[PDB]
Symmetry: D3
């Protein structure tokens, strides 16, 4: 169908959850969905489709970096007609305003990537989510009692930064954490008139060097699935 | 006191509305506020303090362009301790889904300025508003029965654009109008850890219409004004 | 007949003296012109026409920053058929070749703005004044006894710079002072085949923080005004 | 022992083969390698150590994109002591000098990414492979009677290009095909004083539209698999 | 003495005339100077010292390109104590405001080089001549009956341009001709606090296609030479 | 015949040996070629045809800097039918893998010039030599017993650099030495479907600061010549 997704047309529901790690996505399908039938597995990048509280939901891994995320989100919108893309995952905090376990809602995605300048006249595309999803995440959060931290994130092309000295500046300008796909996902979705949002769970503070225990991490990530699926319904 | 504002300490309330045009500021003061007082007039750039429905609120002009907007917003925060800034200005429409007098909430402000690359390590800063202010706008506008179209704007260094052939690309990327200040307001309020939000009344249609007169740019936007005043109550 | 000027064509003489501050424009009309009449006042941005030594001269405020200056200058030329633009204003000395009270003629205007790159093929536009005007400044300064300093200025998008460590380099390359509109005035007049020249008064030192007494501030600005009007008689 | 690789130190041979798809990596292990064990599997990104004609060969998938490829290559070098990195994979031809089933050796990787400007002082990093490895590809191919195509490639952040009009210019400048990783691999190997080369098989022509992705793939994929192991032998 | 000049110290007079062609420089020496004497000859790049109407001047060849020009101008200033640098040469006209046989004074040199952004903070350096030298050139041409055309030149890295379709836009922004060194000569002079000026003779019109007959070419150059020599007198 | 080359069509063999100093070109002709004929001399830029071991070979000087180089290389290929170009000269070493007397072969030429961004879509053009020439050089080296050092070089627009603090980082990324033309040679050849390669001999090491003597300089250079003529034998 498309070189990166194995599914037949109609295998995806119009709402889809996204993570870079497919084994993470396979863990969502099992612990949380009912029917759940693996629908794609090109390059071992798995996606699922199943039911949560009787409502249909799809899941899909997108890999690491803006370019990889862009590839999958583009095919999900144009070929599989996904209408809402809710990204979840881990991010390293850089701000004193957040700490371990927090869930960060990204109202904007800064970037050191060139992709949006190629996309957008060599100007500064402000990469933002769809507002009603952000609204929905806020409401669903409060309904569950989750202190949702809301700010920007910085999407970088480097996992191992060459500019760690710049983390303090990014925090000053209201970036609560660093990750690597939100700006690509946000730009792809504005390109293709789809509804996207990124949520991030704080498991490592790049500044206070604090970190959790591998069971607190599966604990925390579990607390994020619930909000993501409760808000897809 | 500062080079651009001559108000006493404590003159400005912690909540302030902004327009580029100090005469629209004076118009709101005279027409909407009780006990209105002019508190600053440097360079003829008026600001005012008064009460709206029993509660104190300030109004300040900020001139035209990111540079000028940044000057006033920096001083409002650092010297005058203003904590919430709400811009209610004019813009030019670029999609057909918005009309001559429509109100836009800018969830993001793209730009062709170099100012954000200067502040932000030559990377792409996603200039964005405070989310809680976004929420307050959306719900109050719904409460009040005012149509509030929500999306990105593009903040340009140019009123008379050299890139009119790109309006459609911009509109495709969820930019509902063009103005000249949102990105600076947003960037400065991120730098100084303050809450900012931009609302926009269409005053020109860059495609399928013409333009309001100078007098019309002052008096034709009372719904925006009232949305703003009601948000700060 | 434009959104930022409510004068009629013909109201502006073909040579206009420009200042960022419209109250300063008001002072000049009152003190130095005969028969001065306010001709525009949108956004409180005053402009006047009157006479000096029997010669018709217009005054117009242009606000702060290249974007604001570009707007007014574009409208003055394209609608109001102004052919000679002579800008005065204050500047912050960065170089040892000048001291407080000096009048600087800017033969070059560097910038941190992206506008000239947008205007000019993404290359480096050398923004420069009209040479005939520059000869008129020089011969008039000689007649009047003014020791006219000549060099480049740097036109910044920031009043509160994020690059103060750079002022020595800037000064090394023959930048005598920092201001905020020169590059935009020069570039707009090159685009539109008009004659333009910027003169600046050194009111304080960005590098020593020494500043002019209020009395010295008015006196040096008056000297500059007299030079401009004499230039245009 | 690294965020993205499961193996134990000493599990990787110093020579390693790389493909974006871990399923082609897994393929080579079970069709070409003697005594093949799965040394890593984080995020379903598999790696293998085995013997080929008795000699020590490792295999590792690097994901899709410059940022995905950079993470892995960085960890293989800096942690698992890999010294020679031979990437093989697919590309879309854009040059008339090559057709499908052709194999391309990238003497240079050009890029639309910003990562190398960020690595390399905002200048033009000419991302090249190690000449030794390139000498061994030309000799091995000549021995195996493989008609090797030798020129630059273009490493893009976009699989779905927004600049398809640019393909003729790249061709004229000796760019034989487009892929998404070589410029990252090459700069990461340059940063880390390692040896890398990239090899490319034409699976589709982007200009002439011709395509070969259902059966003739693994026919010529295997022809490139043999070249790679034979030059590592 | 320096890598590119082998004059002895004191061999160069503080006023030096420049050209890209060492043989045109030789032409000026033989035919206009008394007590003429070749003083340097590294790389076949000649420089001379002689006397014109009792006043000693020097001539130097500088090559083609900003890179080349910068090298010789840096050494001329820092080692051979040269204070005043006057480049004369040809240029291809692009503006209808200039015709064949016109001499152009470049009050600004725009550029497509990156050298000035490298020197200047990644900002825009408006490269300009020394005003007092420009003034002297105007005074001399007026004495000599020469109508000096004054405006900008565009100094390009390309003789065979890839952007000829842009010449109209350049001409519109007051660029009168295209050459190759002026922006470098101006930036070096500003960096090193020396007085420079570039004069320009029009032997070809890049768009009208008008051209001088080779016998008009010597006539034409000779007018510039006398002007240039007359103003160092 | 071209504005910069004085030869007739067919005055060049299709293999040319390039150096920036035309006096080193002429030195080569006297001491190494049989019956060398001077075939051009415009701008004192000498070129020659001659024989070496019964083989027709050409020599051409090209000046300093990418801009000068690109001029001559373009005319050589487009007008004078040169298909193979080999550049030799000095270069200042920066990497601790090379030392005095070493000969470096450039498999990539990085740069701080904008010329390749202009040529190549504001992206990164990996400026690389032709592979057959690089093999022929490597093989000729082995037969002559020369220890060919192989890596990137950095072509700068500056002889007197403003980023000497950056040289270590260049070395780290496999940049062996700095020169001033290689990136322009390679880019023009890639533009014009021609084959080119650069080799440079280390005279000075810009890091540790050691320098050959002008008798050691002559022998060291003679050694490179013999290499270059032998590969074009
Ligand atoms: C309010 N209206 C507009 S429309 C521009 C425009 C309209 C008509 C003709 C030419 C230009 C804006 N453009 C940038 N900021 C703006 N604010």
């Amino acid at each position: 169908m498309t070189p990166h997704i194995n599914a037949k047309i109609g295998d995806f529901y119009p709402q889809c959850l996204l993570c870079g790690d497919p084994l993470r996505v396979s863990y969502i399908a099992k612990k949380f969905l009912q029917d759940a039938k693996e629908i794609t597995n090109v390059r071992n990048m798995l996606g699922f489709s199943g039911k949560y509280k009787g409502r249909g939901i799809s899941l899909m891994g997108h890999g690491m970096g803006i370019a990889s995320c862009t590839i999958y989100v583009t095919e999900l919108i144009k070929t599989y007609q996904v209408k809402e893309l809710l990204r979840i995952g881990t991010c390293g905090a850089i701000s004193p305003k957040v700490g371990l376990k927090d869930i960060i809602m990204a109202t904007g995605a800064s970037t050191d990537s060139k992709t949006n300048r190629v996309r957008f006249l060599n100007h500064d595309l402000s990469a933002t989510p769809d507002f009603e999803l952000s609204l929905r995440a806020y409401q669903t959060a409060k309904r569950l009692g989750i202190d949702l931290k809301v700010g920007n994130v910085f999407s970088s092309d480097f996992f191992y930064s060459f500019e760690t000295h710049a983390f303090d500046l990014m925090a000053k300008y209201n970036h609560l954490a660093i990750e690597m796909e939100a700006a690509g996902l946000y730009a792809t979705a504005m390109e293709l008139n789809a509804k996207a949002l990124c949520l991030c769970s704080v498991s490592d503070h790049l500044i206070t060097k604090e970190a959790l225990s591998p069971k607190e991490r599966v604990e925390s990530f579990d607390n994020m699935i619930i909000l993501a699926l409760e808000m897809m319904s």
